Amino acid sequence: MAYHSFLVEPISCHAWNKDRTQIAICPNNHEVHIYEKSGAKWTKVHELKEHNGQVTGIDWAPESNRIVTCGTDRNAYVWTLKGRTWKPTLVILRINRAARCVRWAPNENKFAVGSGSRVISICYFEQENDWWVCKHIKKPIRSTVLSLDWHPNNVLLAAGSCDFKCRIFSAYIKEVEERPAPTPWGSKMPFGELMFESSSSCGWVHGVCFSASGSRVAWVSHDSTVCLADADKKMAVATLASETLPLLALTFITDNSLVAAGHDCFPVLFTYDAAAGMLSFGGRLDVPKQSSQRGLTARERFQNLDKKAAGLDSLHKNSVSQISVLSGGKAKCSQFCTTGMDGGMSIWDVKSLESALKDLKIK
Amino acid sequence: WXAXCPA
Amino acid sequence: WXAXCPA
Amino acid sequence: GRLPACVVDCGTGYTKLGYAGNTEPQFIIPSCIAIKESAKVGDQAQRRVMKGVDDLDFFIGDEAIEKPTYATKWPIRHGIVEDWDLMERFMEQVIFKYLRAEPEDHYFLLTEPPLNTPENREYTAEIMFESFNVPGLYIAVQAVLALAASWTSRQVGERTLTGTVIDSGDGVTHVIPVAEGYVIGSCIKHIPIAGRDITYFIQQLLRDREVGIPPEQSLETAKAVKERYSYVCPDLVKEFNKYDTDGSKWIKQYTGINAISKKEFSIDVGYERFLGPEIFFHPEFANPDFTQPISEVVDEVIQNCPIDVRRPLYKNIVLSGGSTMFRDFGRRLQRDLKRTVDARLKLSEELSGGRLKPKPIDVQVITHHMQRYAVWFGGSMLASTPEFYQVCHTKKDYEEIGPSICRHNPVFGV
Amino acid sequence: TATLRPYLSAVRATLQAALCLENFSSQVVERHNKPEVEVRSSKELLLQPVTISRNEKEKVLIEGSINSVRVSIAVKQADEIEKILCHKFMRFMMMRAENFFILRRKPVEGYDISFLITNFHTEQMYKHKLVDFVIHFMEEIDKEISEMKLSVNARARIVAEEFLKNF
Amino acid sequence: MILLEVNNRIIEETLALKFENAAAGNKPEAVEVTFADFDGVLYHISNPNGDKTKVMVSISLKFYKELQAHGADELLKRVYGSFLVNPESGYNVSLLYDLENLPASKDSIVHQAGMLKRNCFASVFEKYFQFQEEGKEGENRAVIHYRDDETMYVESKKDRVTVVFSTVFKDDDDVVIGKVFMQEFKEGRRASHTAPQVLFSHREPPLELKDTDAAVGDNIGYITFVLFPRHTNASARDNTINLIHTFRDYLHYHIKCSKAYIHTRMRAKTSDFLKVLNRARPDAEKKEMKTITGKTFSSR
Amino acid sequence: DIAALVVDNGSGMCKAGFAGDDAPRAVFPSIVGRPRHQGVMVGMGQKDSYVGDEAQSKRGILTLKYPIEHGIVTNWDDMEKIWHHTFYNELRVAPEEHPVLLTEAPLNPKANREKMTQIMFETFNTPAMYVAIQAVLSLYASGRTTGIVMDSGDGVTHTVPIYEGYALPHAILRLDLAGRDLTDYLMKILTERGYSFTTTAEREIVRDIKEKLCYVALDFEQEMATAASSSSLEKSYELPDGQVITIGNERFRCPEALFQPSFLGMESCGIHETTFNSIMKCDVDIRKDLYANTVLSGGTTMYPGIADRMQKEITALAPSTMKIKIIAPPERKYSVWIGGSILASLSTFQQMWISKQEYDESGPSIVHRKCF
Amino acid sequence: LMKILTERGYSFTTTAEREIVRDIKEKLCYVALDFEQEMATAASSSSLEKSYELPDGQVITIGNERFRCPEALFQPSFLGMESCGIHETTFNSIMKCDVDIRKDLYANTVLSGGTTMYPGIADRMQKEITALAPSTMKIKIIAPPERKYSVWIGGSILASLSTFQQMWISKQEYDESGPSIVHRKCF
Ligand SMILES: Nc1ncnc2c1ncn2[C@@H]1O[C@H](COP(=O)(O)OP(=O)(O)O)[C@@H](O)[C@H]1O
Ligand SMILES: Nc1ncnc2c1ncn2[C@@H]1O[C@H](COP(=O)(O)OP(=O)(O)O)[C@@H](O)[C@H]1O
Ligand SMILES: Nc1ncnc2c1ncn2[C@@H]1O[C@H](COP(=O)(O)OP(=O)(O)O)[C@@H](O)[C@H]1O
Ligand SMILES: [Mg+2]
Ligand SMILES: [Mg+2]
Structure with missing residues (x-):
């Protein structure tokens, strides 16, 4: 548990490697900065500069150690670590607007890039030509694709959009993997199929996430509502309308409990009751911290008496934009990392958070 | 005042 | 100074 | 009515x-403008709020330079x-x-x-x-009106509507080519080097050399030295030599009045006779950003206008503004322009093969009765x-x- | 003041229900990044324009979006002198619209002033302090205009005394 | 400048220049200068029939008819002597200076030539001052059309002289500020122990304007001065005439300076609001020290 | 933002730095040395005027001259030398690119600041300057907008009372009595013991003795009777040639002159009574706020136990219900400079410069309009 | 004057030099008939400077100061005083009285005291009062040729009166009623 502010400008997106010893962040510009954990302090080890616009999606494949970065220059790059430097391989996305998000597949054989061209790009490799190619899922989509998360069976793909709908497409690529096994979502799974499409018509969808077992899909809306669709119950939707500001990211720490965050800057916890089909506000995870005041010197007193004649009680001073699971997977998580629009990186802990608050029960 | 006394 | 005291 | x-x-x-x-x-x-200014603290938008009717206690023009207890500001x-x-x-x-x-x-x-x-x-x-x-x-733009002021001093039948106007005032020098009455705006040139830069250069020259000039008049003198003993030289180093070897003739004396005790001070006007106007043909003397003479700027102005209106533009270069009232300014300008034009014409003839000798472009600089x-x-x-x-x-x-x-x-x- | 307290509370609560802005690149043009409420290019990134009014002629129109908020204020103007002074004052505010980073050089038609808070203003500057600035403007503008009116009255009296003194 | 002045600067400048050129012995050059003044007055200094030795200064006024009445030229004649000649075609009054018969002390005739409009006005106005001095009640009362939509109703009685300005401004902003500048005009009599009785009205015209053709309406304001025999005596009537003459122009002038006054307070309040906004910009952790120009410091 | 040089340059020691720091970058005694013997060893390099620390180190063969005396510049050539050494040798910065915030004591002749402006604009060509009053900067450094600053430099002492920012210019009390007079008095009284310092190179030794050994006695007569009845106050100082001297009674007799100038043959009141008079000249409604905000500064108020003496002396002159606070921070010597860096780093201060252009058209008479 | 002389560079601090400054004030100072115009004149010429010789041979020249010292009488704001000038003081003292007499006082303003021996103080006082008082009334400043001893002359005339011998405080009266008798015997 700690908080580290890498910079004062927002962090667009971050990604960790397998052993959670290095982090790749976006300093709110074209570069990708790879920092390494050295004892208790962070030290920048790599700078990846190939993009023309600011990066909007980074993802780090654990087993193969390949980074994928998509930015607003309509391009994607796959960085591989040659000796001591990261060399990029360009992927031809064939989109005509800025990309928005990128996600490796669980088996690291393909990756999905959601863009603002109203398409999803499933990119894979062609070792016959050393050619990173891509196919397009573009039928029921009518706006930007904001968030992606893959099913544990390497085929299905949850996608939230600015068209108010959360969908579950089938990203089956019949040239890199075998025909998948039937899931409670459907038995017919050709590429580009539509397995599920939410009924919401209000608020954009900032974040979607599959369960640890791939039987539940949860998402957050700008409508302040957090929803969860269960597949073992005829794809039934359980919604919870919050009374705070909207959420931007979420994750599955267990098969029953979610950890969301957003424009409130503090993580909240929700729970799912399968015996009733309804979400419950588990409550705020962070304990409101008391920020110490400092006495003013004479140089600073006059400097802010001439020029201008903390308010927030959490670690982050701006909205939280991305939540990842550090260690423990999604079946039983113990650490989750949050990055927001204040350049900070909060490594949380589930055990310490459950210890600090005894009114907090994780289903 | 105006005439007589001040005010 | 000029008058009073030196300076 | x-x-x-x-x-x-x-x-x-x-x-x-x-x-x-x-x-x-x-x-x-x-x-x-002469306004009452005292020692205050705070911003400029805050110390300008005058209580009562005190914001009408100001003077302008000639009556603002005489006032010795007011502060004179140039807006x-x-x-x-x-x-x-x-x-x-x-x-x-x-x-x-x-x-x-x-x-x-x-x-x-x-x-x-x-x-x-x-x-x-x-x-x-x-x-x-x-x-x-x-x-x-x-x-209206300033120099484009200056063209219709040369018609009162030129013979009948040669009052044209086409010419390159060169307006050199106190703060700015701009070149505007007018053709048939239509301002060719996309070719206008604008240089912030003008009379006042000459006056700053001349006072800095006088202050590095002369003694006896009252500080409160160190500018007022550099104007009377600039608008009286200043001329244009055909060559710079040759003029420095002419002043060095025969100083008894080229070095003048300026006698002014210290307007506090009414005594008279005398200074020697030397190199600043010809170094003042030279910042027109060497703008780096006063502003190191610009490095281009005025003849070359005029030539670029005229060479950017349409082709069939280049030859009349060279014929009616009308000077305007006070800073162009330097002796033999138009002469040196026309000499440099004629050099450039004749060299270009000879190069074009040589490249053509040597069969035609085109008409030499007539270059004229018009000084008139109304320049000031x-x-x-x-x-x-x-x-x-x-x-x-x-x-x-x-x-x-x-x-x-x-x-x-x-x-x-x-x-x-x- | 204390007669604008519920009106200002409602305006402030509606301001921090919007101003939950996010970065967003355009959809109708290749690589531009433009405020989506100013261009009105996509109708899916535009929230409902909500009006909060204290009476018929004092109101705030808030137009939200995914990466921008447009807050137009129609101020109280009781008589013609207050109208003239409010016009001139809003104009002198627009003149410096790069020192006010959230200001707009021209008000929305029908409204007296307009602020345009994009997402960069909420990433690089404090959000709650922007809300506080808007609410403080709405609190103090009437008072400042009334003091302008009193200044005009004092100027008129001084001019009258300066004339009738010479007789 | 608070109080407007009565002497025109262009007339004085031109005539002084001509008189300096003539007194030094230089040959006279041509002159043709046309210009204007307040209240739609039009001046023209020229030469009669290209005669470069004579300079004729003509003036066209708005009280055209009131100056042609019998006895309205006593002051003009008295002050201008032989300089007063027949009006130039299209103008109303005309002086004629011969550059070869100029008397000594050329400052006095130029000081009296710059006040041509003031003298034309005071000539048509001292009629009622005299009608009141001579102890006659019910003397002639008229309406001087000193402008084109505004009037000045003058009346002379046994013991007073009543002057009623019927005034209206052209622009809407000027009208709105003029309502204030005229409402607050009775608060001036607290600045002096001797000031003429001033009455303001815009609900209804006074009872003096019910037999006459002075401009009336629902957008016009009426300002009544009651000049008593301590403001119209033979020693303090010059100042009174100057003030009654330049009153409307002075009010217009100060209405138009009120805006340039208010602009400073508005700039101050704009800066005060910018200082309240400044609380939103997060103070930097380290700034790079620059130079007066703005370039890098180039040193520690 | 722009970097503006802050050059205190009071009498005694010149302290120059950049605006925005917490301590002056270069502090050196404002002296100018001149060789007073023939040069015989040619080929080693020689100079005809040493400035600052170099003149101090070589003081054995120089005639140290202070260009400033009692807060007034009396030799402008040496002042220009000092400024040149400050600009091009200590700070090593081009002066024609940075504004300059100089300081001047109150109630000085106007010709002083006039010639200062003329020198700073016509010799070094600074693009802008500003001449501030020392005590106002001292109050800036203390981080408060109300109080009476009591600045006792090396050549001049002065008090300025300020309330809510509105300085009262009719109660500013100046007193030409400071470290140099005390140094001369110590030179005088050191003879009675048996030591004679008479040359301008040994005045520096006497100044070091003063600022290392001298201190202020809380009760003068008691301390006199004590040090005159027992050898428990004597201190020994080693001259730069091995000799050791022992001073007893003199230790507190040197600074005591500050509290009763009758020793120096002067008529003016002590510094405590001067401060009390300055306070009493202000209106009755602010005195209580001044008593609790007395501020000391200058290197002459660095004597051990002077805050307690000033408190004990003012408390005897003020009503028994007023609380007397002597706010003496341990960084008092640099306070006048520290307030300067605070001032020149403000945003609105860019609207208070004297731009080179504004001077080029109005001569030196502009400082009286742009700077109070 | 001791304060403003430091502007020129002259420093008089001890009580012995206050007498020199007082001799300068009572030999060179004069009241200006128009303060702003005299200030503008003394700032654009050298015809208002006068040289005084200290009693050691040193000669000083004072210019603008000559009339800035007595001007404090008409503008105490220079001294940081809130009170009004002596002209407004006299006018207010007149206006405190009944109406019918305000005329006579207007024509019988009598200066007195040494401080009113400044050249040009009568004219300045007259101008100020006639600018304050109504225009009909007449203002006459009775500044006698001598007014340094006028109080003493009046005291002499009073003591030499024959009807005054019944108003002395007699020794027996003091021994009977103590000092406080001075509050009732004297007005
Ligand atoms: N005869 C002259 N010779 C040289 N310079 C002159 C002359 N007359 C004026 N100037 C300079 O030109 C400037 C004024 O000319 P002007 O055309 O009025 O400029 P502006 O119109 O911009 O004020 C002044 O800087 C003055 O020094
Ligand atoms: N810490 C100290 N203790 C005692 N005396 C000191 C101390 N510091 C400085 N002084 C004496 O005070 C005198 C004047 O102070 P200084 O700061 O030099 O004035 P200024 O600030 O005008 O340069 C110096 O000569 C020095 O000897
Ligand atoms: N001619 C003068 N000019 C200026 N000041 C004067 C003049 N004569 C006297 N004074 C000053 O006025 C003060 C009053 O003078 P005086 O008539 O002696 O009354 P008092 O006896 O109360 O002092 C004196 O202190 C003196 O300094
Ligand atoms: Mg011009
Ligand atoms: Mg000091």
Whole structure:
């Protein structure tokens, strides 16, 4: 548990490697900065500069150690670590607007890039030509694709959009993997199929996430509502309308409990009751911290008496934009990392958070 | 005042 | 100074 | 009936006031304002709030330089108004004290340099339309009116509507090629090096060498030295040598009066006789950003205009403004331009193969009887015609569209 | 003040229900990043324009979006002198619209002033302090205009005394 | 400048220049200068029939008919002597200076030539001053059309002189500020122990304007001065005439300076609001020290 | 933002730095040395004027001259030398690119600041300057907008009372009595013991003795009777040539002159009574706020136990219900400079410069309009 | 004057030099008939400077100061005093009285005291009062040729009166009623 502010400008997106010893962040510009954990302090080890616009999606494949970065220059790059430097391989996305998000597949054989061209790009490799190619899922989509998360069976793909709908497409690529096994979502799974499409018509969808077992899909809306669709119950939707500001990211720490965050800057916890089909506000995870005041010197007193004649009680001073699971997977998580629009990186802990608050029960 | 006394 | 005291 | 339109040419070092229809400006005052300034602390927008009626305790023009207890401020720098409070007060005394015009019965014709930012025009429109409530305004470029001031001194039958106007005032020097009466705006050149830079250079020269000049007049002297003993040299190092070997003839004496004890001081005017004007043909002497002589700038101006209007433009280069009243200025300008043009023509002939010898381009620099106020008289022409009242921005146009009515001028497209 | 307290509380609560802005690149043009409420290019990134009014002629129109918020204020103007002073004051506010980073050089038609807070203003500057600035403007503008009116009255009296003194 | 002045600067400048050129012995040059003044007055200094030795200064006024009445030229004649000649075609009054018969002390005739409009006005106005001095009640009362939509109703009685300005401004902003500048005009009599009785009215015209053709309406304001025999005696009537003459122009002038006054307070309050906004910009942790120009410091 | 040089340059020691720091970058005694013997060893390099620390180190063969005396510049050539050494040798910065915030004591002749402006604009060509009053900067450094600053430099002492920012210019009390007079008095009284320092190179030794050993006695007569009845106050100082001297009674007799100038043959009141008079000249409604905000500064108020003496002396002159606080921070010597860096780093201060252009058109008479 | 002389560079601090400064004030100072105009004149010429010789041979020249010292009488704001000038003081003292007598006082203003021996103080006082008082009334400043001893002359005339011998405080009266008798015997 700690908080580290890498910079004062927002962090667009971050990604960790397998052993959670290095982090790749976006300093709110074209570069990708790879920092390494050295004892208790962070030290920048790599700078990846190939993009023309600011990066909007980074993802780090654990087993193969390949980074994928998509930015607003309509391009994607796959960085591989040659000796001591990261060399990029360009992927031809064939989109005509800025990309928005990128996600490796669980088996690291393909990756999905959601863009603002109203398409999803499933990119894979062609070792016959050393050619990173891509196919397009573009039928029921009518706006930007904001968030992606893959099913544990390497085929299905949850996608939230600015068209108010959360969908579950089938990203089956019949040239890199075998025909998948039937899931409670459907038995017919050709590429580009539509397995599920939410009924919401209000608020954009900032974040979607599959369960640890791939039987539940949860998402957050700008409508302040957090929803969860269960597949073992005829794809039934359980919604919870919050009374705070909207959420931007979420994750599955267990098969029953979610950890969301957003424009409130503090993580909240929700729970799912399968015996009733309804979400419950588990409550705020962070304990409101008391920020110490400092006495003013004479140089600073006059400097802010001439020029201008903390308010927030959490670690982050701006909205939280991305939540990842550090260690423990999604079946039983113990650490989750949050990055927001204040350049900070909060490594949380589930055990310490459950210890600090005894009114907090994780289903 | 105006005439007589001040005010 | 000029008058009073030196300076 | 109609009353004559007011013409107010506001320049950096001097403002010319008059009523359109006359032959010369009714007033030529310095563009300065004397206001009461004391030792205060705080911003400039905060110490300018005067209680009561104390914001009308100011003077302008000749009456603002005499006042020894007031602080004299110059609102216009490089032709661009940097202070709008002082400019509004200056305008209100220009209208209500000197011109004695009721600003609701007279169309106004103000002036501007080429590169005046559009926000300056919008502020001028806001001032003249909402504060003074003029029925119509017209902000014409300064040098384009200076062309129609050379017709009073040239023989009949050779008063052309095509020429390159060179206006060198107190704060800015701009070159405007007019062809057949249409301002070729995309070729206008604009250099912020002008008379006042010469006056700063001359005072810095005098202060490094001479002794006995009272500090409070160190500028007032460098103007009397510049506008009296200054000429143009055909060569610089040769002139330095001519001053070094025969100083007894080329070094003059200037005798001024210290206006506190009325004693007289005497200084020696030496190199600053020819180094002053030389910042026209060597602008790096005063501003290290520019490095291009004025002959080369004029040649670029004329060589960018359409082809079949290049030969008449070379024939009617009209000087204007005070800073061009230096002895043999036009002569050196024409000499350099003739050199450039003849060299280019010989190169074109050589490249052609040597079969035709084209007509040598006639280059002429026109000094006339009206240079010191050549702009204003031009305005006094334009603001005396009927068609003038068809190109002004009527009060209705402002009341409808707003100050953005005055946002366009012939230097930029769309 | 204390007569604008519920009106200002409602305006402030509606301001921090919007101003939850996010970065967003355009959809109708290749690589531009423009405020989506100013261009009105996509109708899916535009929230409902909500009006909060204290009476018929004092109101705030809030137009939200995914990376921008446009807050137009129609101020109280009781008589013609207050109208003239409010016009001139809003104009002198627009003149410096790069020192006010959240200001707009021209008000929305029908409204007296307009602020345009994009997402960069909420990433690089404090959000709650922007809300506080808007609410403080709405609190103090009436008072400042009334003091302008009193200044005009004092100027008129001084001018009258300066004339009638010479007789 | 608080109080407007009565002497025109262009006339004085031009005539002084001509008289300096003539007194030094230089040959006279041509002159043709046309200009204007307040209240729609039109001046023209020229030469009669290209005669470069004579300078004729003509003036066209708005009280055209009131000056042609019998006895309205006593002051003009008295002050201008032989300089007063027949009006130039299209103008109303005309002086004629011969550059070869100029008397000594050329400052006095130029000081009296710059006040041509003031003298034309005071000539048509001292009629009632005399009608009151001579102890006659019910003397002629008239309406001087000193402008084109505004009037000045003058009346002379046994013991007073009543002057009623019927005034109206052209612009809407000027009208709105003029309502205030005229409402607050009775608060001036607290600045002096001797000031003429001033009455303001815009609900209804006074009872003096019910037999006469002075401009009336629902957009016009009426300002009544009651000049008593301590403001119209033979020693303090010059100042009274100057003030009654330049009153409307002075009010217009100060209405138009009120805006340039208010602009400073508005700039101050704009800066005060910018200082409240500044609380939103997060203070930097380290700034790079620059130079007066703005370039890098180039040193520690 | 712009970097503006802050050059205190009071009498005694010149302290120059950049605006925005917490301590002056270069502090050196404002002296100018001149060789007073023939040069015989040619080829080693020689100079005809040493400035600052170099003149101090070589003081054995120089005639140290102070260009400033009692807060007034009396030799402008040496002042220009000092400024040149400050600009091009200590700070090593081009002066024609940075504004300059100089300081001047109150109630000095106007010709002083006039010639200062003329020198700074016509010799070094600074683009802008500003001449501030020392005590106002001292109050800036203390981080408060109300109080009476009591600045006792090396050549001049002065008090300035300020309330809510509105300084009262009719109660500013100046007193030409400071470290140099005390140094001369110590030179005088050191003879009675048996030591004679008479040359301007040994005045530096006497100044070091003063600022290392001298201190202020809380009760003068008690301390006199004590040090005159027992050898428990004597201290020994080693001259730069091995000799050791022992001073007893003199230790507190040197600074005591500050509290009763009758020792120096002067008529003016002590510094405590001067401060009390300055306070009493202000209106009755602010005195209580001044008593609790007395501020000391200058290197002459660095004597051990002077805050307690000033408190004990003012408390005897003020009503028994007023609380007397002597706010003496341990960084008092640099306070006048520290307030300067605070001032020149403000945003609105850019509107208070004297721009080179404004001077080029108005001569030196502009400082009286732009700077109070 | 001791304070403003430091502007020129002259420092008089000890009580012995206050007498020199007082001799300068009572030999060179004069009241200006128009303060702003005299200030503008003394700032654009050298015809207002006068040289005084200290009693050691040193010669000083004072210019603008000559009339800035007595001007404090008409503008105490220079001394940081809130009170009004002596002209407004006299006018207010007159206006405190009944109406019918305000005329006579206007024509019988009698200066007195040494401080009113400044050249040009009568004219300045007259101008100020006639600018304050109504225009009909007449203002006459009775500044006698001598007014340094006028109080003493009046005291002599009073003591030499024959009707005054019944108003002395007699020794027996003091021995009977103590000092406080001075509050009832004397007005
Ligand atoms: N005869 C002259 N010779 C040289 N310089 C002159 C002459 N007359 C004026 N100047 C310079 O030109 C400037 C004034 O000319 P002007 O055309 O009025 O400029 P502006 O119109 O911009 O004020 C001043 O800087 C003055 O020194
Ligand atoms: N810490 C100290 N203790 C005692 N005396 C000191 C101390 N510091 C400085 N002084 C003496 O005070 C005198 C004047 O102080 P100084 O700071 O030099 O004035 P200024 O600030 O004008 O340069 C110096 O000569 C020095 O000897
Ligand atoms: N001619 C003068 N000019 C200026 N000041 C004077 C003049 N004569 C006297 N004074 C000053 O006025 C003060 C009063 O003078 P005086 O008539 O002696 O009354 P008092 O006896 O109360 O002092 C004196 O202190 C003196 O300094
Ligand atoms: Mg010009
Ligand atoms: Mg000091």
